[PDB]
Amino acid sequence: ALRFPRFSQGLAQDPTTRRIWFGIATAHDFESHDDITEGRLYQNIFASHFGQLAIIFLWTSGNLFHVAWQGNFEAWVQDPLHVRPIAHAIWDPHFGQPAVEAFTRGGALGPVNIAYSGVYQWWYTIGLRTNEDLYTGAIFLLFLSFISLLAGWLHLQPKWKPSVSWFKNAESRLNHHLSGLFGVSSLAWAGHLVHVAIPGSRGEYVRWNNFLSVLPHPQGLGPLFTGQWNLYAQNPDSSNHLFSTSQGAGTAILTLLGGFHPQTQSLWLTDMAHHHLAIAILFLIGGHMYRTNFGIGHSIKYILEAHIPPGGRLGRGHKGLYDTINNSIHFQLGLALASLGVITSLVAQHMYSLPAYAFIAQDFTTQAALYTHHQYIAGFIMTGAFAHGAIFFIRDYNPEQNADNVLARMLEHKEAIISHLSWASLFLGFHTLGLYVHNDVMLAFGTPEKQILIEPIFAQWIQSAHGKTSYGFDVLLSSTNSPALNAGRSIWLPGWLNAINENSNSLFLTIGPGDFLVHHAIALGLHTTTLILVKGALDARGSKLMPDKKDFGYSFPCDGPGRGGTCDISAWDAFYLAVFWMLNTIGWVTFYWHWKHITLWQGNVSQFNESSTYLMGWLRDYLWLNSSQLINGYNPFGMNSLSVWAWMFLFGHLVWATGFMFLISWRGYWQELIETLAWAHERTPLANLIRWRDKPVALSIVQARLVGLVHFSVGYIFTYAAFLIASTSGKFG
């Protein structure tokens, strides 16, 4: 416990280069450090969250700062559809003069990068107008970054270290997070929309210096407290309103219009203000559910304990689950990652189809990057959710205190669970691949009318229930006299029905056979990825091939070549396998999103409707067709601003392919090779004089799986991002 890994004398005493690698890789697994306590575990996590907040604030602060200092925000806000937004300046002494010219874009005086993050549309929509606005925002976030480090440091001091019992006060944290973290923040955010963002959209300029002397609504708070709330919806912006001007500007602050601001193609600010106010009220009421210090409220433990079906089909129901969850941080993080993963996908699905930010709908590359960025983030987050389920089962699960409850009963019938995921994955793979291959052969043989082309009738019927008329189903909101249509006719349905039946936005795009096939591809990916992950979690404690696996922990290289061979038998390896399947799945979903949109934006959805029912269509009319500008970002005839993406595109192919080395060749080959280099080094004059302080050894078995996975994932992402951005920005859809 005297060198580098101060938390692991086991590693500090490793005489090989392995010590340095594993010191880095295990630094955040607090539970496995020398002499951790429960208290220290919580306290380190708690301070680590403050450091993570500090980095988040610091990062946002720089984005603000770099846009204000080197971007064209002030020109963008005066002409948002004719100015490429600048991310930051570039200063690279390797550039030749033709690279300096090509990257000089926007209104800038030097080479710059164009921002595909959407922050200009975001900041503009919420009220930011001037570079100064951005500067003081950055300074404020810098202050928040600093404060977050102060509290982190503070709560690692003995006077301020919180006790385990405090970290386990679940009822109090829930009440505060629901009503305060969620509710008051949403209420306050509606306050910002009403006081700053909405006046900004109506050509007024409300800032800290003047916001006390200007009314958000001519009638003040009178209507709020008298109950005459309709007054706040009275005089909404015209459908001819020009954003950031008073032309057609109304006075409503809280509306329920549905649909889009026709010029900006994004949600009405007065709708978003009403939304944040409404959910705030719900969070604020909901945050009064649990008992704290006042003699009212619920006990979560008692609630769980009561929920046991009389009749016994769930054994002891939920008994014991409060302390199983409240005493296991991997259980908690599993639920956190699982939930955040669902809503990260929700964000991606809802933001492309119901954009909130003015002039982001027509910034095609931004919409492509934003959807792709969150679906990959969501995928990784989902794999972590199961990985920490597995870790929960090994480190924290107490069979006896969960005896016969719903959690133990999952382990009892793991073979039923796993073998049905297996069945569902087999069904979806055989038939989805079988159907695409059939269609390909039909195309190959000049007989496309012999394709199997199943109509996505169930989803089309759902779009019709939502009011889309494309399919003639005439259901619910597509009907003429459904009570559903009658109830909302007076409110949100005029603006919604308009948006859903406009076929040049992204709200509920028209779908045919091509959308059917790739949705079953997607269901294949979801089912197979969860198969790996569920099988991984449920066998983590033990299988017939290794019935004592729990005694070996989450990650171990294997259990040796006996009993027939046991490579990749740990729960950590099931995670490792699942990442490939998650990257596959998100690949399929993002390919689909992009190709559906690029043919939409180009004005010929029929290119997708026809070429997508067979796989040669995807290879040729999606990947090959859309690569031509990207791979010419530099050629024997010069280069252009697509040069970076052409280079990163190949960089991504290179990192990915290097991953294959760590994945295919395994350790023993390389350990023997390194030995001949140890010999050679100790027998080479002059070089004899120099000696290593760490014995060179081949990487560990597990290490190589990780290094390979990381290379594979990194090249996967960089290849697709380069293609996505170049193909979309080289033409603007």
Partner: peptide, 30 residues
């Protein structure tokens, strides 16, 4: 240009060299 010509070589050459040298001595210490 008057500041990028200062910070880009500082964060991309000096800081990594100072960091790599610092970490080399901590990891090698006994």
């Amino acid at each position: 240009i008057n500041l990028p010509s200062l910070f880009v070589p500082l964060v991309g050459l000096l800081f990594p060299a100072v960091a790599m040298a610092s970490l080399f001595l901590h990891v090698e210490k006994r």
